[PDB]
Design a binder for these strands. Structure first.
Lengths: 48, 121, 48
RNA sequence: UAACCGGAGAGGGAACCCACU
DNA sequence: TTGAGAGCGGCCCGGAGCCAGCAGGGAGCTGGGAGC
DNA sequence: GCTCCCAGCTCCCTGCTGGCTCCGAGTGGGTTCCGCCGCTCTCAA
């Protein structure tokens, strides 16, 4: 339950739902090279 | 000088050797011809009687790579590759033979010498 | 999931269920709802 | 009337297919 | 002198935002005529 | 008979439906592959 509740609260901690997609993780400003290390690289670096 | 042995023979050789189904560039379907696995007589026979379904590998489409009912005596059921493509590659069964194809004009002559009338009259 | 004789609301738990829980889809494959009543309405099969 | 010299880095790559986990 | 050759030179599906097109409220604009 | 509440109008604006990018677990091993056409001079018959 520690890990499960930690996953769910890290999902919901931004005041709204966070589906594990580029379509969310690009919207959170959690590091341009985190975004680059995600599946899209050139667009997120190029926007940063 | 009009005919080109290069443009016929070299193109055929390149296409057959590569296995890409184009002329020089085409994309094109690969894997049409492979290298025979000269390791065992059974291996050679399997690679010779191997059958390929060109349905999309590395996909979640279960049905075309599922095992169908229409395989009694056409393909042995318990012979599949194990890796990323399970079920798209088959090996030919014993009694199974492929129709060579024939012209239907003598058959139509048989119909018309017999009594089966065409649709226009 | 080995299914059942009844429909059982098509629970379809497993890999795709955990998939859509990881990335919440606006149209899940089986959006199911469990409904509880108050009292004698649920106690009676006819009122149910 | 002349005296001990020493030396080893590499060369493509890109695609397809097969096999194994 | 002319003809061809050697070599240089150039020419199978998934989701999901997402914009664009269209459709219904909405106040301004000026007529309609009620009122003075 | 001209303002002004109102009716029709008229733009005005937020609100619904389509083309479209982007993703799709780990090594070995073998095979194929990377111009063509043009063009002018040299030696041969």
């Amino acid at each position: 339950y520690r890990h499960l509740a930690l996953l769910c609260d890290t999902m919901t901690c931004r005041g709204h739902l966070m589906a594990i997609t580029r379509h969310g993780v690009n919207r959170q400003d959690t590091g341009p090279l985190m975004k680059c290390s995600f599946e899209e690289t050139v667009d997120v670096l190029m926007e940063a | 000088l009009a005919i080109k042995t290069r443009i016929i023979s070299d193109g055929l050789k390149y296409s057959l050797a590569t296995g890409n189904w184009g002329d020089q560039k085409k994309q094109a379907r690969a894997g049409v011809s492979q290298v025979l696995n000269r390791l065992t007589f059974a291996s050679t026979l399997s690679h010779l009687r191997r059958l390929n379904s060109p349905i999309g590998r590395d996909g979640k489409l279960a049905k075309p790579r599922q095992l169908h009912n229409t395989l009694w005596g056409m393909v042995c059921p318990a012979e599949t590759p194990e890796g990323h493509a399970v079920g798209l590659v088959k090996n030919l069964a014993l009694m199974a033979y492929i129709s060579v194809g024939s012209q239907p004009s003598p058959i139509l002559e048989f119909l018309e010498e017999w009594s089966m009338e065409n649709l226009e009259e | 999931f080995h299914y059942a004789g009844v429909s059982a609301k098509n629970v379809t738990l497993g890999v795709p269920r955990l998939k859509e829980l990881i990335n919440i889809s606006k149209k899940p494959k089986t959006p199911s709802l469990t409904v509880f009543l108050l009292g004698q309405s649920a106690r009676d099969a006819e009122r149910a």
